[PDB]
């Protein structure tokens, strides 16, 4: 029918990737769901439950759709760690993803593995392209934990209006992830001036100096936080907390301990 069809899968996730979505503005989620796309399968918002919803996913995948995958895919010991309907998450994805016109990995968990993939990765979770790359899935990676609503919706609409966005080697659309947070950070003035906070309760902290010494991973993170803001109102560094590199592969291990450079 009319509006392009979207099938939204939930794997090893926290659901913060779907709540980020509900935060979209211009368009609001109502305009999105009723005028831009057809949300055919979405566990969190569905009216019917049990088999009524599985019959829906089943018929939607017979058509032309875009697949949205939230969460990492558990693969250790066979992947029984994550089940929907009694079926392992990897089995559902292996079936759905390859029939889609495009696959979009939402959240650092779907893109790279995420929180459950930090050491020692009890469940063997992996991102989408690592799990399904061999079934031919090449997903667009919208990184962040969670990503800015703008980067996911702006990619859906792009995909639907202009085509496939140019990606970086990490799979992220360069239009949103092409510059580091540091390059757009307003505390850059302090940085350039050689003015740093070495403690949270100090006068420098109160003056909004650079958090580099306090572990800001801004110089290493690709995201558009400073320029887009979150909730149209704030971002970590503005709230005086350093950037934790939440849009980067393996941040959990690579960038922790968080409060030390």
């Amino acid at each position: 029918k009319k509006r392009p069809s979207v099938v939204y899968l939930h794997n090893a996730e926290c659901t913060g990737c779907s709540e980020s979505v509900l935060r979209t503005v211009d368009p609001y989620v109502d305009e999105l769901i009723l005028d831009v796309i057809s949300m055919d399968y979405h566990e969190t918002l569905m009216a019917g439950a049990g088999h009524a919803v599985e019959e829906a996913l089943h018929e939607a995948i017979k058509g032309d759709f875009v697949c949205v995958i939230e969460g990492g895919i558990p693969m250790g010991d066979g992947g029984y760690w994550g089940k929907v309907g009694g079926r392992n998450m990897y089995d559902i994805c292996a079936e759905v993803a390859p029939k889609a016109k495009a696959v979009i990995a939402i959240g650092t968990c779907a893109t790279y593995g995420g929180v459950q993939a930090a050491k020692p990765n009890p469940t063997g979770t992996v991102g989408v392209n690592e799990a399904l790359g061999k079934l031919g899935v090449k997903a667009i990676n919208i990184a962040g934990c969670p990503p800015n609503p703008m980067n996911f919706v702006g990619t859906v609409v792009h995909l639907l209006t202009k085509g496939m966005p140019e990606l970086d080697k990490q799979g992220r659309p360069v239009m949103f992830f092409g510059e580091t947070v540091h390059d757009n950070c307003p505390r850059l003035k302090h940085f350039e001036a050689g003015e740093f906070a070495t403690s949270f309760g100090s006068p420098e902290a109160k003056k909004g100096y650079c958090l580099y010494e306090l572990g800001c991973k801004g110089p290493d993170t690709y995201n558009n936080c400073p320029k887009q803001l979150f909730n149209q109102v704030n971002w970590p560094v503005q709230a005086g907390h350093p950037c934790i590199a939440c849009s980067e592969p393996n941040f959990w291990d690579l960038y922790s301990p968080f409060y030390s450079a």
Partner: protein, 530 residues
């Protein structure tokens, strides 16, 4: 015969419900949590200062609450006394989290089990607007209502129903009884709540940096000096008032109205044993300095409220996918996942089974509201009365699925009422020049600490054991672990399983009566299992 609902939709995470019916009534029940992430295993040996960032990710719906319980558990195990402004700011952020959480649950997660959206198409908009106008002080027009009806029509007419595909009310359902005119007021409010939720989240982001997943808290206090500006408090204050008004004038009024056509649910899904740790302290080291009180109700006896004793908590694994059958207090918790398949060795859940002094308990808005009310918390007492008075029932109507649902409405407003108090103080302190948000701290050689949070879904506690500034043990015991966990070693039914027994099922092929009960608990499977 059995009825299995998998997936249960309109919840957070992966849940499967299996029930045994006999004479049209649920006779047995099993709550099956089907995803394991293993956050406590990942924490092992890390820096306690990192915990908060990992734990926060146990759930993005009840975002922030785990950051708080973690920073409270490390604050406690290091003996730090955070400044008053960090206490106020942590409280405002939680207040805003209740405002948001509750509103989204009622309308986008729960409404659809009581409301037939398709019937709204059969309402007379002028008659719907008149009724709406007799329910609250907010003026409604036909035209706005006619407009929502045109939206629904435009959608139905496209053939792409989206999230209404196979809804249980499609083509009528015997368990769905509201007039088409209430179905249209409720549909107009559901779309409206989608826009208010955006404002509630933005308000939280004023103190929290962002929503979902705040980033302004540290062990020792808070980091947000920027928001201490009059401009930023004014901003927050404006959004806060818009949202507050909507809960008082639309959420509450709609809640009582729908509940009014389903009074038989005031006798369905009953429980005994309620507990809370309270929330919103003045003294971070005193459960009794909390706005909403702490306490333990046994059975359904509101005349005797005991003292909450955390030493009485043990988590079971006899029917969960973990090694053996030992129950442990959280400081001595173990997380060794051992899968044995669905009902393999009768184990049926990735959730542990928390028991209090060996008994099964219910945590959440109902539990919280019953403790406050029994302890005579005025805000609470004035609010419970309004409700019973409005439904023309007594407090005994509170022990049910209906009660579990009105209590969330009550908890959402009392929190909302108090946000004004903390703001005001925060603001006066900044005006007087008192602007500190952080306290320095050092680690003891070896220490243990606990963080008690009363999240929107009930009692949350993070337990840490550190040695050398390295985590030896980190255990989370979440409200949904209490409500939705499997049976314990003594084979006792968790609160959801027990609430299920006796539920009548009209159409077993479309068993919304199980959803009404399961949803009243606001399950969060990501939180319950972590």
């Amino acid at each position: 015969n059995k009825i299995v609902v998998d997936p249960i939709t309109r919840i957070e995470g992966h849940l499967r419900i299996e029930v045994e019916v006999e004479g049209g009534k649920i006779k047995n029940a099993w709550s099956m949590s089907t995803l394991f992430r293993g956050l406590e295993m990942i924490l092992k040996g890390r820096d306690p200062r990192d915990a908060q960032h990992f734990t926060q990710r146990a759930c993005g719906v009840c975002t922030y609450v785990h950051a708080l319980a973690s920073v409270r558990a490390v604050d406690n195990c290091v003996g730090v006394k955070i400044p008053e402004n960090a206490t106020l700011m942590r409280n405002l952020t939680m207040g805003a989290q209740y405002m948001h959480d509750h509103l989204v649950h009622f309308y986008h997660l729960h409404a659809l089990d009581w409301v037939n959206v398709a019937n709204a198409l059969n309402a007379d908009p002028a008659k719907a607007a008149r009724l709406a106008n007799d329910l609250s002080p907010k003026k409604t027009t036909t035209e706005s209502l006619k407009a929502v009806q045109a939206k629904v029509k435009a959608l139905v007419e496209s053939g792409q129903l989206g999230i209404f595909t196979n809804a249980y009310f499609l083509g009528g359902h015997p368990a769905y009884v509201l007039p088409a005119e209430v179905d249209l007021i409720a549909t107009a409010h559901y779309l409206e709540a989608l826009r208010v939720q955006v404002k509630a989240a933005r308000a939280m982001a004023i103190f929290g940096a962002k929503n979902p997943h705040t980033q302004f808290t540290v062990v020792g206090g808070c980091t947000n000096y920027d928001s201490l500006r009059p401009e930023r408090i004014a901003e927050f204050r404006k959004l806060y008032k818009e949202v507050r008004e909507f809960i008082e004038q639309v959420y509450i009024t709609d809640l009582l109205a729908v509940a009014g056509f389903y009074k038989n649910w005031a006798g369905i899904g009953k429980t005994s044993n309620f507990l809370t740790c309270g929330e919103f302290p003045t003294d971070e080291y005193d459960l009794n300095s909390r706005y909403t009180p702490q306490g333990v109700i046994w059975g359904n006896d509101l005349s005797k409220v005991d003292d909450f004793n955390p030493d009485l908590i043990e988590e079971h694994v006899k029917y969960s996918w973990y090694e053996g059958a030992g129950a442990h207090h959280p400081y001595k918790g173990v997380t060794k996942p051992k899968w044995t398949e669905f009902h393999g060795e009768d184990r049926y859940s990735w959730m542990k089974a928390p028991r209090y002094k060996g008994e099964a308990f219910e945590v959440g808005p109902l539990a919280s509201v019953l403790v406050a009310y029994a302890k005579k918390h005025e805000p609470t007492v004035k609010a419970v009365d309004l409700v019973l008075k409005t439904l023309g029932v007594g407090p005994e109507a509170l022990f049910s699925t209906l009660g579990r649902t009105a209590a969330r409405g009550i908890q959402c407003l009392t929190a909302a009422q108090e946000v004004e108090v903390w703001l005001d103080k925060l603001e006066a302190n900044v005006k007087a020049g008192k602007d500190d948000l952080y306290t320095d701290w050092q680690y003891p050689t070896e220490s243990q600490g606990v963080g008690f949070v009363n999240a929107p879904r009930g009692m949350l506690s993070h337990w840490i054991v550190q040695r050398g500034g390295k985590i030896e043990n980190f255990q989370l015991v979440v409200p949904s672990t209490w409500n939705l966990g499997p049976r314990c070693a003594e084979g006792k039914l968790s609160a959801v399983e027990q609430a299920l027994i006796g539920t009548p099922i009209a159409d077993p092929k479309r068993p919304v009566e199980i959803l009404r009960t399961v949803h009243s608990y606001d399950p969060c499977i990501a939180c319950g299992v972590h």
